Amino acid sequence: SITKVFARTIFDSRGNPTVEVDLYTSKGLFRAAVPSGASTGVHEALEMRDGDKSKYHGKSVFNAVKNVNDVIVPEIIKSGLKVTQQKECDEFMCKLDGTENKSSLGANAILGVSLAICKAGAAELGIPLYRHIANLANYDEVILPVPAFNVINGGSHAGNKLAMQEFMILPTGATSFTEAMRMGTEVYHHLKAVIKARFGLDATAVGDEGGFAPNILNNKDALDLIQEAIKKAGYTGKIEIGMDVAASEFYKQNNIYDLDFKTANNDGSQKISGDQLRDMYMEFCKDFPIVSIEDPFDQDDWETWSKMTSGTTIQIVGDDLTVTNPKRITTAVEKKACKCLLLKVNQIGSVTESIDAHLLAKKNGWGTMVSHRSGETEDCFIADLVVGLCTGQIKTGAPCRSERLAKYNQILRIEEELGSGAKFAGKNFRAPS
Amino acid sequence: SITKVFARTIFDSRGNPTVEVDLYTSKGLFRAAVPSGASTGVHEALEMRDGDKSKYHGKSVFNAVKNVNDVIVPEIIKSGLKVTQQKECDEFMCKLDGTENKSSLGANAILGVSLAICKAGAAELGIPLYRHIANLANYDEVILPVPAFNVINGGSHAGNKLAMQEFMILPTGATSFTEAMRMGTEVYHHLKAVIKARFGLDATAVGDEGGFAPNILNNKDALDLIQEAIKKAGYTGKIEIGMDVAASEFYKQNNIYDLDFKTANNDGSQKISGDQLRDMYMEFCKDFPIVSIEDPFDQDDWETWSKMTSGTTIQIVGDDLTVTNPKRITTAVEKKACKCLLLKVNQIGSVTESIDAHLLAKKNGWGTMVSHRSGETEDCFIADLVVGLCTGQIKTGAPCRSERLAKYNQILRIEEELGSGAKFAGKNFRAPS
Ligand SMILES: [Mn+2]
Ligand SMILES: [Mn+2]
């Protein structure tokens, strides 16, 4: 039974307020923190901010914190639900909310309590959190994931010209998670050396996710840079590349992608319809070891999505397309729009729904890549989530900034706990379990 | 009694390996991680890296980890010392090391175990860590500190032209720690807006400590920028400025400071002897609300240090000068070289010595500013240390990057625990207890 639930305001990796929940059972205190979130969006669960631009730039969360403390807390204490009843507790809170997008209480309110209940539940049962998640998802085995280290930024998370949002490396050819961390950090540093040389020391500063953001023009330039770091590190053929185009941002008029790559007059110099953008992807695919591409098109450019998924043998990740929403996932499944779900727990709002989102996708042949948010915290929960859900692939930042390393370090501790019989997804990252 | 001690390698906020120690007593597991460190230096305790440039760029720590596991661990388990005997445990390890700078076992080896023992000791006694530290240091009361948020970078931590290393803001005029976090983040954001405007979006990327690093020329430019953010935020007169000149880096020939501010030929354009540099400081002091200056001169320019300390009424912080070393502190005390110790626990190597370093300084009228390292971890130990040592002032990064916010968030949780009777150093930050 829950003896106490108390939320407080803490600050995320970007300097903005966010919710932190303390939950008590006779076993003790269980703490969880909530990452980023859409303060308003039309597909994902709404994180409740205050909007008073006077206080914290309209980003405070005293409201979400209050909904937890004086609404969720007393109600769930009297509900008599045990932390061992994840689905029931999550269900209760949603009922309590009434809205479909958790707009009454706030998804950040619900998720914080939901995450805390999960950690408490694993403690009630006397098992580590990754095991409790596996059991909730019906897995008998867990597996160490392949990390997708964001290393070069553009579009967002940083701001130059480079329209493609993320360029990541994936040590698919690593023998273990330890070895993948080594391959990952070494390349990261060698890449720092390269960017410093090619663009000067000042270009080695980092964006929200710890990745460099040199003033590069063509996306291909980014890939070449990465390709050099891998060679320098001597990891050619062990590391593959991954992308997140976030194409929804530059989708302009009908069938037109652009953004002028952040140039109010770069127009025409990038008057490329989806098919031209799709061809461009294929060139990259044969020229670089690109194994996964996220959001190649706008979240509503369904037809170019299906075409690309049908015509390639690489992973096509749905982020803005699916929005961790089972309704969106279902449509994307019917349309064969993609073959991978980017799992962002705060997008849906609870642990139970997040797990169901993953099982849906997995049931329909998809892969699942667990994802952090731009605004993360020191909470390392998704590290246990990715191991527990046996997805084999996590995207939680470059190995720089501790809100990122908090997750990676935790997966290494888990690895150490699994012993010699710890399995690393590796080349089977797309669907290892 | 210690039933088990096991170290492992984890990654710091910069992507480099560092030591993490797990310590067990019948009360459970107590974990601590070690930050940055001088892999070799002549004044501070030496952190042991491996040097094999093939592995992790010569930065691995399997040696330090091994010294813990197969040397420190069995020895301290059989020693029969209790975690409640901080001084004895720390003493034992130093004996065990034999060297003066902890070069046999590695300061990173010793400090990790030392930090873990401290957390275990507070648990043995049933009190929070900040209280256990207060009691170790003989304090009856604890006090919430004034945060020194590094916001603009130069010299190191980033790399432009700006030779002065750090420019920080200090909400000395805040009513509480909560209010100081608000004042701190708001200014940080307003400053992001300003830098974006004046130098473009790309200039808002951050360095090792979460602070922006625009390509500014004159240090005065940095101060003006900050001054604008404070005005925009509407906090003029509540926030003061702090600096860390790290002058040791640009100290060239006899009585000559320069660095050409990172220009192989900026020579002459900054042929300034100490006295010219000292005058420059005074101009800043009357023109901007500068309350504290760290390392105004080279760690051996003793005479210009004394002159400056004697002639001003602001805080003069010794970082490279003192190196958390009681021998250096003693000399600086005799010479009246400064009036504040920057406390970096890993510089000295143990909790006991760190506490003694603080008491020495405090006994001689100095202030103590607890400091993080460039390469931090998600460990929030120094947050309890600064509250416990009643220093009233901590320098743990900009409110950006979670290895920084881990500390700030922890001080807010402590604040919440102290209740209404929680005292905030504020204007008395220099020596509040
Ligand atoms: Mn995306
Ligand atoms: Mn310094």
Swiss-Prot record, chains A, B:
Molecular-function GO term, any one: magnesium ion binding
Superkingdom: Eukaryota
Note on cofactor: Mg(2+) is required for catalysis and for stabilizing the dimer. Crystallized with Mn(2+).
UniProt key word Acetylation: yes
N-acetylserine modified-residue sites: S1
Amino-acid positions noted as binding (2R)-2-phosphoglycerate in the UniProt annotation, renumbered to this chain: S36, H157, K344, R373, S374
Amino acids binding Mn(2+): D244, E294, D319
SMART domains linked: Enolase_C (SM01192), Enolase_N (SM01193)
EC number(s) per entry: 4.2.1.11
Biological-process GO terms, alphabetical: glycolytic process
Family matches, as InterPro entries: Enolase (IPR000941), Enolase-like_C_sf (IPR036849), Enolase-like_N (IPR029017), Enolase_C (IPR020810), Enolase_CS (IPR020809), Enolase_N (IPR020811)
Entry annotation: catalytic residues: E209 (proton donor), K344 (proton acceptor)
HAMAP family reported for this sequence: Enolase
Family the UniProt entry places it in: Belongs to the enolase family.
Name of this chain's protein: Enolase
Upper taxonomic lineage: Eukaryota, Metazoa, Ecdysozoa, Arthropoda, Crustacea
